[PDB]
Design a protein around this ligand. Structure first.
Ligand code: MG
Ligand code: MG
Ligand code: MG
Ligand code: MG
Ligand code: MG
Ligand code: MG
Ligand code: MG
Ligand code: MG
Ligand code: MG
Ligand code: MG
Ligand code: MG
Ligand code: MG
Ligand code: MG
Ligand code: MG
Ligand code: MG
Ligand code: MG
Ligand code: MG
Ligand code: MG
Ligand code: MG
Ligand code: MG
Ligand code: MG
Ligand code: MG
Ligand code: MG
Ligand code: MG
Ligand code: MG
Ligand code: MG
Ligand code: MG
Ligand code: MG
Ligand code: MG
Ligand code: MG
Ligand code: MG
Ligand code: MG
Ligand code: MG
Ligand code: MG
Ligand code: MG
Ligand code: MG
Ligand code: MG
Ligand code: MG
Ligand code: MG
Ligand code: MG
Ligand code: MG
Ligand code: MG
Ligand code: MG
Ligand code: MG
Ligand code: MG
Ligand code: MG
Ligand code: MG
Ligand code: MG
Ligand code: MG
Ligand code: MG
Ligand code: MG
Ligand code: MG
Ligand code: MG
Ligand code: MG
Ligand code: MG
Ligand code: MG
Ligand code: MG
Ligand code: MG
Ligand code: MG
Ligand code: MG
Ligand code: MG
Ligand code: MG
Ligand code: MG
Ligand code: MG
Ligand code: MG
Ligand code: MG
Ligand code: MG
Ligand code: MG
Ligand code: MG
Ligand code: MG
Ligand code: MG
Ligand code: MG
Ligand code: MG
Ligand code: MG
Ligand code: MG
Ligand code: MG
Ligand code: MG
Ligand code: MG
Ligand code: MG
Ligand code: MG
Ligand code: MG
Ligand code: MG
Ligand code: MG
Ligand code: MG
Ligand code: MG
Ligand code: MG
Ligand code: MG
Ligand code: MG
Ligand code: MG
Ligand code: MG
Ligand code: MG
Ligand code: MG
Ligand code: MG
Ligand code: MG
Ligand code: MG
Ligand code: MG
Ligand code: MG
Ligand code: MG
Ligand code: MG
Ligand code: MG
Ligand code: MG
Ligand code: MG
Ligand code: MG
Ligand code: MG
Ligand code: MG
Ligand code: MG
Ligand code: MG
Ligand code: MG
Ligand code: MG
Ligand code: MG
Ligand code: MG
Ligand code: MG
Ligand code: MG
Ligand code: MG
Ligand code: MG
Ligand code: MG
Ligand code: MG
Ligand code: MG
Ligand code: MG
Ligand code: MG
Ligand code: MG
Ligand code: MG
Ligand code: MG
Ligand code: MG
Ligand code: MG
Ligand code: MG
Ligand code: MG
Ligand code: MG
Ligand code: MG
Ligand code: MG
Ligand code: MG
Ligand code: MG
Ligand code: MG
Ligand code: MG
Ligand code: MG
Ligand code: MG
Ligand code: MG
Ligand code: MG
Ligand code: MG
Ligand code: MG
Ligand code: MG
Ligand code: MG
Ligand code: MG
Ligand code: MG
Ligand code: MG
Ligand code: MG
Ligand code: MG
Ligand code: MG
Ligand code: MG
Ligand code: MG
Ligand code: MG
Ligand code: MG
Ligand code: MG
Ligand code: MG
Ligand code: MG
Ligand code: MG
Ligand code: MG
Ligand code: MG
Ligand code: MG
Ligand code: MG
Ligand code: MG
Ligand code: MG
Ligand code: MG
Ligand code: MG
Ligand code: MG
Ligand code: ZN
Lengths: 204, 118, 131, 19, 59, 122
RNA sequence: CGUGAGGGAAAGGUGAAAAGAACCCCGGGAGGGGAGUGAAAUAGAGCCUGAAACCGUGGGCUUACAAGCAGUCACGGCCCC
RNA sequence: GAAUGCCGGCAUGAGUAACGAUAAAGAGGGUGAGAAUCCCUCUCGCCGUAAGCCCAAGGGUUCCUACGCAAUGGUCGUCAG
RNA sequence: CGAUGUCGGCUCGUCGCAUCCUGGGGCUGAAGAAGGUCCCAAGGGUUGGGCUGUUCGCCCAUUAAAGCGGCACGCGAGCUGGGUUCAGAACGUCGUGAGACAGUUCGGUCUCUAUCCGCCACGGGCGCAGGAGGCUUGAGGGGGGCUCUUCCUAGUACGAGAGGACCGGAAGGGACGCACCUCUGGUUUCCCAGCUGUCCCUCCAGGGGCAUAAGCUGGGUAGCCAUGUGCGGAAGGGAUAACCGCUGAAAGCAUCUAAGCGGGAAGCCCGCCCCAAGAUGAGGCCUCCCACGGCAGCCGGUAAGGACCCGGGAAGACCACCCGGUGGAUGGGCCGGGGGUGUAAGCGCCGCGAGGCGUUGAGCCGACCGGUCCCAAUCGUCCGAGGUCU
């Protein structure tokens, strides 16, 4: 199980064998291992990875000390990859070849307080034919005296987005080791400049 | 939402908000320093800086441009003759906002000052 | 980090240069690589370009034509590998960027509206005169 | 599903003159 | 709509419990480097008229 | 994008001039038909003594749509009308000609007789 | 209040005596604190007595893993006499 | 101790709804214990078969000026019917 | 009966299984294909139309199927008001009449503010025996769960023929769901342009207001979007249902069972995605500070840290979260690029003139990719450990 931290930079399409293929460009590495989670010590198997150089004037002493035990330059983002033990002390885009498929995790764009039509694709009300002040309302939310309450998990309006989202089985289109670029076919959660995690796919 | 939207609404419709910036600009250029609520102040920075930069061009075009917002021919003269020269060697940032330490009694609004920079 | 540049970098290998400049109102002929069965070939779309939307590598243009009584419109990526060549068959002088309005005009009307761009036509003939 | 159509028990509420 | 109404008087306890968040927060104040008066940070001192070292306004 | 209640110009010499879609034959509940899709349609306008007549419920294949249709090369193509060719249950056109251009997509969808009979295939 | 006929309220008490608080202090005033009067000023005029609902300040005991007509019986802890 | 009792007082809902046409505001200068709200100036906006002007009903000092800001004014107030 | 609002529709569902489909079976008057019948199975799915207020039903076109029921004949402090309980009016019929009729007909006031429970979201407080910054384990919970057509096998097996497979393999779909904005296509309240009437600046020219809360019209970046794009349903492992067996007695035979074992469902467990240590059973790892002064308590200054305040943010109702705060590129300006609009003003020339041409892809120019300390994040303040007992 391999993986790398990265930032979503933007979208384009490229051409491949006379086909347009939309891609999301991801600036992937390079990620240094800063901690290795071992069974005997930690209970499981993973690698704490760093990403993006940080101004040491912003990094406190407990964090500074952590970085030092790995002999690693202060990084902005500290993140783990499960069941991953690369041989290097540094992880680069080269852990992926084109053609391979990957799962990508990001933080979805935040709709803030979303109504029930936008959140759960509800239908809302008529916009005429008598409809009274309920054009975007959720309608009924229950039965009557039996059960006399509202289900846990009832789809209602409220905050939506800004959450962890993992689109799955995305094709690696190309990789550019010289610039740490990853080209993934299709969409990737979250905004440009947003942090993302790219892992070996779990789909066969 | 509001994702990457730029520019306030200031609870005015389009033509009112436009009139607002103009009447604020005219005052700033008139007295060199005015006091307003902090948000209007921050929004005035850019509106006027453009007009000042245009007086720094001096060309008839720019004059007729600035005239659209400022409307007063004598004020535009002062802009071109007395004001714009001061900033010949300054690249943007002709205005500053400093926040006052007290609030309006009648509605507790935080105030700031907007002045033409030296 | 410069995300814009990073994009342009990815795009660079696919950017094309051999295509001629043109404007909406110009009558142009796109020579296009087309597959059918199972060989490929060239098919030419000759019509008036009524839109050019710009997004760097991602700009696309729209070419309009009537064929056998039915109007047809085609959209091409300005850097589509499938374009062999683009030939300027005529320069037209429009007064706006998008000419959707010619969709509702007779042949007479399109002509009086899109008079020949005598200026840019001269530039064309003044070019080609090459050493 | 009930077949014998069942009649209204209450009238449609109507307003009163308010004292 | 059918005119919702409270079903029971809120107890002395329950309303005061509502108001466990109503405490004001004291104005955040710093001393003015020039005249040593207390004033809110990032404002121009309304006691001496100084900010960022220079005199800015008539007090 | 065709749907029930849509009118279609019929681009052949079956005698039909207008047909109205009453169902799209693409699975159990397709909301729209595009080029190459087969629909069922009532004949709403037809000329005297045709092969088909006003009222006839027929099957036809969409050959031209006003909603531009996207191709894998990143190009698109759009038509000035929605048009169909009336066919029999074996995909074969009932007419003997087709008028005006047709979408190339018909070929990849096995409608070679129509593509052949078409003046142009854009 | 009602066009009108007509309907139709609420509202008493400083002290024996105004001796009804000069003057000073904060305040724009209201209000207060000193001074002064008085047997008494939480009798100060928003004045006899001044209950209760209701609101608040201080203090003792108590409470953020707990199930309720709020009590009652037992025991323990802490505080007070 | 109960009569959807009578009179009064005081709570709850609650710092909640709301503050009465979406014609619209900004700054400068005064006054003042206090100013988004009062006076002046400049900019802007609205009415203009009125949202201007005259008359009749009705209202009955509301008119003018000086002095005031406890209440009235849906906020404020130095302003005011 | 000091009121439990009543048909149908809409919205939003959830549940049952006497199962409509899809999955698994036995029997068949099962050749195959297609059916019939019963068993198991409630995971998901169960279309759009015409008529009628209709539920129901008939009908059209499809479909894998167009399941049946419960939830106050689910759901009017969610909506509707066509049905039906008011007052108006008329027809048939009944009554001498006033009027009346599970007979019909046209019309006919559906109430801004949610206290408590519950539900969706988000915080504040304390706790998890020192005080702190990170990174995690996953008890437990949620999400998802659909299906068709064609092709190959193969016109093979089967069949007199017509017709026509199992198993195995490949491609392409419909509806749905999550995310996304490169493309297609929207919006894009002042980004550009053209236009009318009027009034104004300053007479011409050039402009400004108003005609909407954009006067109107043609376009339109970022963003937010679907009609657009990517991706999901699985795979796989385990245990089972109906069912099918292996070995096998009681019962010298027989028996899937009494000992034992195997096979076997879209279902169950796990796997996938998301939440999650208030999981008070309060978990784990890496790193930081440290033996303070004074009288398991209190008081005071601090350490590491944090909060305040400030500039901001595809984060956001407030709060929260996140980034930045002069040893700085956080916003504002300014500069370059992008992008939009589509050749500004002025001048010169041609024309009686409306105009046209040139300078000119000019001028204007939100948000996008960046650069640059010109303007502003000045200066600071308060919190914050001494580590309970076996
Ligand atoms: Mg992440
Ligand atoms: Mg939605
Ligand atoms: Mg959604
Ligand atoms: Mg709708
Ligand atoms: Mg609907
Ligand atoms: Mg209504
Ligand atoms: Mg409503
Ligand atoms: Mg409405
Ligand atoms: Mg219950
Ligand atoms: Mg959220
Ligand atoms: Mg909005
Ligand atoms: Mg911004
Ligand atoms: Mg603006
Ligand atoms: Mg904004
Ligand atoms: Mg306003
Ligand atoms: Mg407001
Ligand atoms: Mg306007
Ligand atoms: Mg206006
Ligand atoms: Mg302040
Ligand atoms: Mg006020
Ligand atoms: Mg209502
Ligand atoms: Mg109490
Ligand atoms: Mg209390
Ligand atoms: Mg409460
Ligand atoms: Mg035709
Ligand atoms: Mg007929
Ligand atoms: Mg009277
Ligand atoms: Mg007395
Ligand atoms: Mg007396
Ligand atoms: Mg006194
Ligand atoms: Mg006094
Ligand atoms: Mg005495
Ligand atoms: Mg005495
Ligand atoms: Mg005595
Ligand atoms: Mg006293
Ligand atoms: Mg007493
Ligand atoms: Mg007494
Ligand atoms: Mg009293
Ligand atoms: Mg007495
Ligand atoms: Mg008393
Ligand atoms: Mg008293
Ligand atoms: Mg107390
Ligand atoms: Mg417990
Ligand atoms: Mg406890
Ligand atoms: Mg308890
Ligand atoms: Mg009890
Ligand atoms: Mg006991
Ligand atoms: Mg006791
Ligand atoms: Mg009694
Ligand atoms: Mg009583
Ligand atoms: Mg009562
Ligand atoms: Mg009552
Ligand atoms: Mg009472
Ligand atoms: Mg509040
Ligand atoms: Mg409330
Ligand atoms: Mg509220
Ligand atoms: Mg109210
Ligand atoms: Mg309010
Ligand atoms: Mg008002
Ligand atoms: Mg109102
Ligand atoms: Mg108002
Ligand atoms: Mg003023
Ligand atoms: Mg002033
Ligand atoms: Mg003043
Ligand atoms: Mg005064
Ligand atoms: Mg006002
Ligand atoms: Mg007039
Ligand atoms: Mg008029
Ligand atoms: Mg009167
Ligand atoms: Mg006066
Ligand atoms: Mg007053
Ligand atoms: Mg007062
Ligand atoms: Mg007075
Ligand atoms: Mg008042
Ligand atoms: Mg009032
Ligand atoms: Mg007067
Ligand atoms: Mg009853
Ligand atoms: Mg009751
Ligand atoms: Mg009632
Ligand atoms: Mg009731
Ligand atoms: Mg049965
Ligand atoms: Mg079945
Ligand atoms: Mg079956
Ligand atoms: Mg069977
Ligand atoms: Mg069979
Ligand atoms: Mg048979
Ligand atoms: Mg069963
Ligand atoms: Mg099921
Ligand atoms: Mg069901
Ligand atoms: Mg149906
Ligand atoms: Mg009809
Ligand atoms: Mg209909
Ligand atoms: Mg029906
Ligand atoms: Mg019926
Ligand atoms: Mg079928
Ligand atoms: Mg079937
Ligand atoms: Mg079938
Ligand atoms: Mg149901
Ligand atoms: Mg019901
Ligand atoms: Mg109901
Ligand atoms: Mg109802
Ligand atoms: Mg209800
Ligand atoms: Mg009705
Ligand atoms: Mg009605
Ligand atoms: Mg009725
Ligand atoms: Mg009736
Ligand atoms: Mg009779
Ligand atoms: Mg009836
Ligand atoms: Mg009846
Ligand atoms: Mg009747
Ligand atoms: Mg009517
Ligand atoms: Mg009726
Ligand atoms: Mg209702
Ligand atoms: Mg309302
Ligand atoms: Mg509440
Ligand atoms: Mg309750
Ligand atoms: Mg919390
Ligand atoms: Mg955790
Ligand atoms: Mg679990
Ligand atoms: Mg639990
Ligand atoms: Mg699960
Ligand atoms: Mg075959
Ligand atoms: Mg054969
Ligand atoms: Mg098979
Ligand atoms: Mg874009
Ligand atoms: Mg777009
Ligand atoms: Mg577009
Ligand atoms: Mg503008
Ligand atoms: Mg004009
Ligand atoms: Mg003129
Ligand atoms: Mg005007
Ligand atoms: Mg006007
Ligand atoms: Mg007007
Ligand atoms: Mg207006
Ligand atoms: Mg305009
Ligand atoms: Mg458009
Ligand atoms: Mg846009
Ligand atoms: Mg045996
Ligand atoms: Mg056994
Ligand atoms: Mg077994
Ligand atoms: Mg077996
Ligand atoms: Mg078994
Ligand atoms: Mg098994
Ligand atoms: Mg499946
Ligand atoms: Mg997590
Ligand atoms: Mg914990
Ligand atoms: Mg437990
Ligand atoms: Mg912990
Ligand atoms: Mg552990
Ligand atoms: Mg120690
Ligand atoms: Mg946001
Ligand atoms: Mg903010
Ligand atoms: Mg910070
Ligand atoms: Mg600082
Ligand atoms: Mg910056
Ligand atoms: Mg900048
Ligand atoms: Mg450009
Ligand atoms: Mg020109
Ligand atoms: Mg020019
Ligand atoms: Mg000119
Ligand atoms: Mg001349
Ligand atoms: Mg340009
Ligand atoms: Mg530019
Ligand atoms: Mg620098
Ligand atoms: Mg401290
Ligand atoms: Zn000072």
């Amino acid at each position: 199980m391999k993986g790398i931290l990265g930032v979503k930079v933007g979208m384009t399409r490229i051409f491949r064998d006379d086909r347009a293929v939309p891609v999301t460009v991801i600036l992937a590495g390079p990620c240094p291992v800063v901690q290795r989670r071992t069974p005997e010590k930690d209970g499981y198997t993973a690698v704490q990875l760093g990403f993006l150089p940080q101004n040491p004037k912003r990094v406190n002493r407990p964090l500074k000390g952590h970085f030092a035990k790995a002999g690693v330059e202060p990084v902005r983002i500290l993140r783990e990859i499960r069941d991953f033990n690369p041989e290097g002390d540094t992880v680069t885009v080269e852990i992926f070849k084109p053609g391979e498929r990957v799962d990508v995790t990001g933080t979805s764009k935040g709709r803030g307080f979303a109504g029930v039509m936008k959140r759960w694709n509800f239908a809302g009300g008529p916009d005429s034919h008598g409809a009274h002040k309920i054009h975007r309302h959720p309608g009924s939310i229950g039965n009557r005296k039996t059960p006399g309450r509202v289900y846990k998990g009832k789809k209602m309006a409220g905050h939506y987005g800004a959450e962890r989202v993992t689109v799955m089985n995305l094709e690696v289109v190309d990789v550019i080791p010289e610039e740490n670029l990853l080209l993934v076919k299709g969409a990737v959660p979250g905004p440009n400049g947003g942090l993302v995690i790219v892992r070996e796919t779990k789909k066969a | 939402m509001r994702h990457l939207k730029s520019g306030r609404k200031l609870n005015r419709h389009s033509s009112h908000r436009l009139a607002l910036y103009r009447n604020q600009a005219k005052s700033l250029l008139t007295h060199g320093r005015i006091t307003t609520t902090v948000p209007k102040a921050k929004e005035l920075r850019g509106f006027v800086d453009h007009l000042i930069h245009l007086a720094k061009r001096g060309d008839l075009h720019a004059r007729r441009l600035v005239l659209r917002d400022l409307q007063d021919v004598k004020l535009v003269r002062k802009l071109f003759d007395e004001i714009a020269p001061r900033y010949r060697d300054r690249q943007g940032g002709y205005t500053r906002v400093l926040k006052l330490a007290e609030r309006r009694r009648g509605d507790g609004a935080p105030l700031a000052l907007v002045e033409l920079v030296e | 980090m410069n995300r814009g540049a990073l994009i342009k970098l990815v795009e660079s290998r696919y950017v094309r240069t051999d295509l001629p400049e043109f404007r909406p109102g110009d009558t142009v002929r796109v020579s296009y690589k087309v597959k059918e069965g199972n060989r490929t070939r060239i098919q030419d779309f000759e019509g008036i370009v009524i839109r050019i939307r710009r997004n760097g590598f991602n700009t696309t243009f729209t070419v309009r034509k009537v064929s056998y009584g039915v109007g047809v419109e085609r959209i091409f990526p300005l850097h589509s590998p499938l374009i062999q060549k683009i030939d300027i068959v005529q320069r037209g002088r429009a007064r706006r960027a998008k000419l959707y309005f010619i969709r509702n005009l007779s042949d007479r009307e399109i002509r009086r509206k899109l008079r020949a761009d005598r200026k840019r036509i001269d530039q064309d003939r003044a070019a080609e005169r090459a050493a | 599903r009930r077949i014998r159509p069942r009649p209204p028990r209450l009238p449609r509420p109507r307003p009163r003159p308010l004292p | 709509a059918k005119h919702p109404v409270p079903k029971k008087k809120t107890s002395k306890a329950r309303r005061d419990a509502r108001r466990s968040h109503h405490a004001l927060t004291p104005p955040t104040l710093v001393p003015c480097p020039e005249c040593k008066a207390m004033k809110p940070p990032h404002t121009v001192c309304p006691e001496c008229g100084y900010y960022a070292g220079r005199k800015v306004l008539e007090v | 994008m065709i749907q029930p209640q849509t009118y279609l110009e019929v681009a052949d010499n079956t005698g039909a001039r207008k047909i109205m879609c009453i169902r799209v034959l693409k699975g159990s509940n397709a909301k729209y038909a595009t080029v190459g899709d087969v629909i069922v349609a009532s004949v709403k306008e037809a000329i005297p003594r045709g092969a088909v007549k006003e009222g006839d419920v027929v099957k036809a294949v969409v050959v031209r749509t006003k909603k531009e249709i996207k191709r894998p090369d990143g190009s698109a193509i759009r038509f000035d009308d929605n048009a169909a060719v009336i066919i029999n249950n074996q995909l074969e056109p009932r007419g003997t000609r087709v008028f005006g251009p047709v979408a190339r997509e018909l070929r990849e969808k096995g409608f070679m007789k129509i593509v052949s009979l078409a003046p142009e295939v854009l």
